[PDB]
């Protein structure tokens, strides 16, 4: 599980959670920092070196903006993320 993919993956989870919060009105989800914390906690649960996650915050925000101009409708992106994100969002519950 190479570091750069670790980062793509985690940033995808971060970006999708923000998408949920804002585009799908998941008003139950917390701020971007707690979201980043979770992802980091999650990589640690996997014994991953989070000291290499310098680019993570920025890539996350770059993927989020990509999603907003992606042209897949919001109804669709929200159905998708609401379903696939559940374990991550459960993770957020303890941070």
């Amino acid at each position: 599980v190479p570091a750069n993919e670790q980062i793509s993956q985690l940033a995808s989870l971060v970006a999708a959670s923000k998408y949920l919060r804002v585009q799908c009105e998941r008003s139950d989800l917390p701020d971007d920092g707690t979201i980043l914390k979770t992802a980091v906690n999650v990589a640690v649960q996997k014994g991953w070196d989070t000291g290499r996650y310098q680019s993570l915050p920025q890539l996350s925000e770059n993927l989020y903006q990509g999603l907003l101009k992606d042209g897949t409708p919001k109804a669709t992106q929200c159905s998708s993320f609401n379903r696939t994100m559940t374990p991550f969002l459960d993770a957020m519950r303890t941070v």
Binding site: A11, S12, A16, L67, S80
Partner: peptide
């Protein structure tokens, strides 16, 4: 295709 990229990556993660 950011969404496809992102949904794919999420899928990878959950294996």
């Amino acid at each position: 295709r950011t969404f496809r990229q992102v949904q794919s990556s999420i899928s990878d993660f959950y294996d």
